[PDB]
Structure formats: C-alpha cells, structure tokens
C-alpha cells in the first residue's frame, strides 16, 4: 500500500519513456521514407500522418 | 470552447484574416532561409517573395483594417504577442523588397 504506491510512479515513468523514444525514432524513419511523391494526394497523407504522429509525441513528452 | 458563441460574424472573419497574416510571416521566414542555403534558386525566390510581400500589404489594407491594427497592432509588435520566432522575416518585411 505504501511501496506499490511510490512504485506506481516508477511503474509508468519507464513505459512512457519508451513510447517517446519509439515515436521520435519513428518520425526519423518516416522522414527516410520519402519517395517520388508527386501524388499530392499521398503527400497530404504523409503530412497528415507526420502531424498526427508528432502530436502524440509532444503530448507524451509533456506529462513529464 | 473553440469559438466564443458571442464572437462577431465580422470578427470570425478577422481571426481568419490574422491566421493568414500569420501564415505569411512564418512561411516567408523559411523561404528566405532556404534561399540563403541555395535550396531554392534566385529565379524562383524573387517571384515568390515579391508575391508574398505583396499579399501581406493587402491583408492589412483590407476594408476592415481598423480591427487589424486594433486588437493586433503594429507588426514587429504582433510578432511578440504571439510566440513567433522569425529573425529573418522581420527584416524581409520591414524592408519591402527581396534581392536589393
């Protein structure tokens, strides 16, 4: 009740950490995935997703 | 609460306007940087910039101009009111010409 408590803090702090790593990691790879996008249809879908993603990054980062 | 349910129909149009003024400023600043890293070439740069610099003056010198300067005054200022960083832009703006 006392330990489990102060250890719920560590409990999350580590797993969130990973997502963050994971997300930034992703956006770098996603940048490398950059092709013959003349499809302004697909460029938008790339944007949408990068944006979408980054939102999730900062949101997490924020917590801590 | 996104839009205040007591925000003038005419005001809604004014926000939309600022959103454009903003849009110009931050965008321009990049263009310029890109040109100082050759990414874009002169031919390209001078048209596009000139174009922007023109567009800007128009937004302010729109019919509903009062409200602009009003809640969102003289420009170097408005750049601070909003967390906006653009050390190039602010020179490309206050000087109304690109290549010089």
């Amino acid at each position: 009740s006392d330990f489990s408590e102060k250890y719920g803090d560590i409990a999350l702090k580590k797993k969130l950490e990973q997502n963050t790593k994971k997300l930034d990691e992703e956006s770098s790879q996603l940048e490398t995935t950059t092709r013959s996008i003349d499809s302004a249809d697909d460029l938008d879908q790339f944007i949408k997703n990068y944006l979408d993603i980054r939102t999730q990054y900062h949101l997490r980062r924020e917590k801590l | 609460p996104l839009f205040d349910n007591s925000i003038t129909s005419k005001d809604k149009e004014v926000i939309e306007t600022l959103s454009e003024i903003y849009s110009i400023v931050i965008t321009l600043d990049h263009v310029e940087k890109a040109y100082l890293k050759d990414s874009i070439d002169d031919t390209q740069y001078t048209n596009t910039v000139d174009k922007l610099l023109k567009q800007f003056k128009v937004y302010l010198n729109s019919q509903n101009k009062e409200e602009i300067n009003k809640h969102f005054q003289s420009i170097e200022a408005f750049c601070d009111t909003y967390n906006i960083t653009a050390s190039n832009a602010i020179t490309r703006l206050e000087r109304g010409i690109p290549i010089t």
């Binding site: 900062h58 | 609460p1 600022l18 454009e20 965008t27 890293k37 596009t48 922007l52």
Partner: protein
Amino acid sequence: LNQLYNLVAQDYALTDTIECLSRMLHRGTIPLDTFVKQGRELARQQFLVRWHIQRITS
C-alpha cells in the same frame, strides 16, 4: 480540462512538421511552391491553435 493540454501538443507538433517540410524542400522532395501552399495551410492552422490558447490562457 485536457482540452488545452491536448491543444498545447498541436502547436509544438505543427512547428515540428513545418520544420520537416523545410528540410524536405531543401533536399528537393517537394517543388519550391508546393511548400508555400502546404506550409501556409499549416501555419494558418497553427495560428488558430495558438490564439485558441490565448482564449484559455487569458
């Protein structure tokens, strides 16, 4: 409550995207103009977000 919290992320996120677009433009990926269009459409969006915070943070 988290209405703002969630919004905050957007402002940063957008900034991050536009930066990326810039990098993309530098390495040629997009034509020198598509950048402007896509860029402005993002910035414009951003402004609203930022200003939207002013509503709350005021």
